[PDB]
From TrEMBL:
GO terms for cellular component: cell outer membrane; cell surface. The keyword Nucleotidyltransferase does not apply. The keyword Membrane applies. This is Outer surface protein A. Keywords: Cell outer membrane, Lipoprotein, Membrane, Palmitate, Signal. It comes from Borreliella burgdorferi (Lyme disease spirochete). Belongs to the OspA lipoprotein family.
Length: 246
């Protein structure tokens, strides 16, 4: 009979134990009560399965040859224009995409392997939109363009801008409208260490590290302004980021 194969994206497919006369394997899957079926020229669970929703929407599940990626698509009833696409890649990152009534990308939610998210909404034909980053304990809000995602935190006269380029590189900057030389914050970004160093009155006050684990840490400098003291503290709420900008 059949063998179960575990799939990325919380799905299972049943593959026939032997091939048919064309050398092909039968595939069966049930995705949220919808039965999908297909035929594959591989034996491991990869290939294409199809079904039809009760509202006549077409559904297709594509499993990459190495079982590393799954793509679950919903189309309009003639199967020609996309409604939604959910892609789990081999790093277990999830891409959740909605399309407008003409099947152009309208909304995209990226769920990282650690569960943090980038939520892109109201996406227009120039790739611009609204953006939100959902971190552990807090949320950052901003905009999207074809060039970058910019998430903004404001505290007093200080604006902190976290940039995620179209390819995923992070840069951070700080602007302060304060004109007093004694209290105005300025800042320098070190991309190599993903660290923003804040300075007040020609002395370093703190390092903000934007880590590869999608967290922010804050570490203070000593009263001189030249060396770090203590240890970095992980931000766990938006208030703590704001406090670092005071």
């Amino acid at each position: 009979n059949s063998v179960s194969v575990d799939l990325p994206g919380s799905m299972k497919v049943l593959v026939s134990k032997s091939s048919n006369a064309d050398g092909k394997y039968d595939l069966i899957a049930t995705v949220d009560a919808l039965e999908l079926s297909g035929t594959s020229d591989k034996n491991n669970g990869s290939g294409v399965l199809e079904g039809v929703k009760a509202d006549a929407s077409k559904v297709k599940l594509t499993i990459s040859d190495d079982l590393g990626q799954t793509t679950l698509e919903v189309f309009k009833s003639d199967g020609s224009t996309l409604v939604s696409k959910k892609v789990t890649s081999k790093d277990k990152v999830l891409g959740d995409v909605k399309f407008n009534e003409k099947g152009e990308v309208s909304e995209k939610i990226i769920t990282r392997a650690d569960g943090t998210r980038l939520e892109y909404t109201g996406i227009k034909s120039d790739g611009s939109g609204k953006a939100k980053e959902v971190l552990k304990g807090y949320v950052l809000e901003g905009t999207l363009t074809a060039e970058k995602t910019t998430l903004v935190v404001k505290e007093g006269t200080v604006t902190l801008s976290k940039n995620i380029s179209k390819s995923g590189a992070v840069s951070v900057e700080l602007n302060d409208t304060d004109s007093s030389a004694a209290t105005k914050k300025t800042a320098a970004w070190n991309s190599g260490t993903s660290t923003l160093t804040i300075t007040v009155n020609s002395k370093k006050t703190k390092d903000l590290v934007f880590t590869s684990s999608n967290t922010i840490t804050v570490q203070q400098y000593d009263s001189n302004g030249t060396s770090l003291e203590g240890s970095a503290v992980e931000i766990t709420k938006l208030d703590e980021i704001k406090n670092a900008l005071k």
